[PDB]
């Protein structure tokens, strides 16, 4: 087994095709299924896996009450093969209310954060063994990507933030070998969706304070230098945001439109164009769409989209989304998952909060239309 290098061009992409769906909530009405949130997908060279942060309980369970709380000592990182729902046989790979995972070509790395809000601990588990650990540096809720990290030549990069102070850690076989502070014009960086862009790593993240345009972080694996900006596209990708006719953007600064909230999302470049996903509803996490914005990676005045696809209808709930990359015979493909959140507090028919997932992958072929929502009937679940 050799280290992954991702030294292949990005695949030609006309859009995205259906890949996977777990139907987790529908199954939990007749079976013991974990309560989860913040899921993501990552693949080793052989097969793909779905991850999620459990709540230490199943859904049909007295302990599923009040699972809207995001930090508890009972949250663990769940790992299953993609398509296997989180049943009672699921492996909890570490203790975590925030996490990131990636495969360097030889073994799995898990970054797992747990503990007190003012004094959290990030554990670094490589090939099933704890190798390193680091304490919160700002003493104010240490958190990380909630999606896959990226490894190149045995060096894995993960973005972590503390307090409102964002750092980029370089990990070799579980050992922190270098730490770089976030540099550039991105003012707030959270929950980065990173992907290999040889010879470096590119991340599209979430600005939870000042902008509805997503920040970008570029990581150089060789000299550990960091540069950061914002996605130029005049069609911004965060939620909440203004409508398409009145929204604006900027390549270096946050747009100062609908700050104070956000949602984890993704985008990746295709020449001067950008592929991105976002919620259809501009204010709430309803629906999910993907499209390409021509000149969207380099022109902040561009609002010309093409190749739109509805992933979730505007009347159905979505949630977090992120990117994962897969190495093919000749090119690196881009895929993404969508978290489909159900329950409290937006839905009062039940006492719990959980999610299912739907997964799409880039295609060079052709495709049609559809909608793949969670599909559970909360009114009937009691």
């Amino acid at each position: 087994a050799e280290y992954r290098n991702w030294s292949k061009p990005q695949c030609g992409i006309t859009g995205f095709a259906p890949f996977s769906k777990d139907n987790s909530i529908r199954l939990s009405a007749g079976g013991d299924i974990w309560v989860t949130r913040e899921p993501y997908v990552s693949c080793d060279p052989d097969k793909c896996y779905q991850f999620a942060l459990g709540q230490g309980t199943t859904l049909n369970n007295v302990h599923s009450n009040n699972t809207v709380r995001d930090r508890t000592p009972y949250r663990t990182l769940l790992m299953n093969e993609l398509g296997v729902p989180f049943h009672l046989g699921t492996k909890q790979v570490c203790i975590a209310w925030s996490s990131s995972s990636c495969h360097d070509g030889k073994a799995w790395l898990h970054v797992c954060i747990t503990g007190d809000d003012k004094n959290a601990t990030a554990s670094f588990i490589y090939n099933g063994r704890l190798i390193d650990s680091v304490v919160s540096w700002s003493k104010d809720i240490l958190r990380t990507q909630e999606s896959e990290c990226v490894c190149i030549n045995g060096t894995c990069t993960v973005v972590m933030t503390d307090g409102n102070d964002t750092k980029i850690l370089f990990i070799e076989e579980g050992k922190i070998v270098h730490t770089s502070k976030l540099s550039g014009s991105a003012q707030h960086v959270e929950e980065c969706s990173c992907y290999p862009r040889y010879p470096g790593v590119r991340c599209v993240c979430r600005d939870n304070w000042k902008g509805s345009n997503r920040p970008i972080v570029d990581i150089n694996i060789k000299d550990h230098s960091i540069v950061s900006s914002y996605v130029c596209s005049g069609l911004v990708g965060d939620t909440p945001r203004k409508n398409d006719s009145s929204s604006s953007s900027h390549c270096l600064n946050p747009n100062n439109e609908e700050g104070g909230h956000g949602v984890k999302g993704w985008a990746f470049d295709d020449g001067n164009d950008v592929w991105m996903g976002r919620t259809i509803n501009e204010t709430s996490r309803l629906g999910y769409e993907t499209f390409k914005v021509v000149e969207g990676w380099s022109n902040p005045k561009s609002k010309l989209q093409i190749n739109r696809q509805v992933i979730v209808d505007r009347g159905d709930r979505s949630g977090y989304s992120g990117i994962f990359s897969v190495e093919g015979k000749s090119c690196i493909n881009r895929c993404f998952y969508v978290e489909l959140i159900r329950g409290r507090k937006e839905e009062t028919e039940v006492l719990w909060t959980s999610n299912s997932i739907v997964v799409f992958c880039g295609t060079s072929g052709t495709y049609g239309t559809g909608s793949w929502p969670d599909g559970a009937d909360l009114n009937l679940m009691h």
Partner: antibody
Amino acid sequence: QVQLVQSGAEVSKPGASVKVSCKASGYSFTSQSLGWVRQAPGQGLEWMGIINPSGGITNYAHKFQGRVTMTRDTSTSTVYMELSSLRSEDTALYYCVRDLSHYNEVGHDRAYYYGMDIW
Amino acid sequence: SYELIQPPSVSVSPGQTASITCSGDKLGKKYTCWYQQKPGQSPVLVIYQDNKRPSGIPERFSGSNSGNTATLTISGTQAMDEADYYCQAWDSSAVVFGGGTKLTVLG
């Protein structure tokens, strides 16, 4: 120039209901949660609940569950507090507050505790 | 339901250092706030996140939270500092206030 201006004083009969309003300005209305703290004459502060103007989700203190309704109108940058089944011990000064905290109970992914910076 | 315990009254002389405590079960694990209410006006946030001062708050006001007690400290107290002081924390997202402490600058 952040400020909250509240409605005028009210006298109400026991058993009825009272509705107080509060207009926010100096910042984007949808960016921060707004709440209500009351103070009986000569007593301490007592939190009633909060509303997130982005989504309208509310979170009330247990003592007032079933008695209070908080609403928001984003077009007018105004929140309201309606307390029903009024009793004599509801005589108090009712403060409108801006809570910079992020509560899971009103739609935030990561809970974050700050405090009430504007009254 | 969680409860915060404050002394009802604390007295100092001009220029002295006042210390107001606030006690609760494992209070050091949680975030605390301090509010200053002068007679006739609304409360004012003087300390948030255990020891942070909002811009415009004098640096005489300091805060600390360790173990089971939170403490607000006012060095070189002036007459204008006479007010009621409330500690504040959270119990499962529910805001909780201390009973309040009357601060008197002895005249």
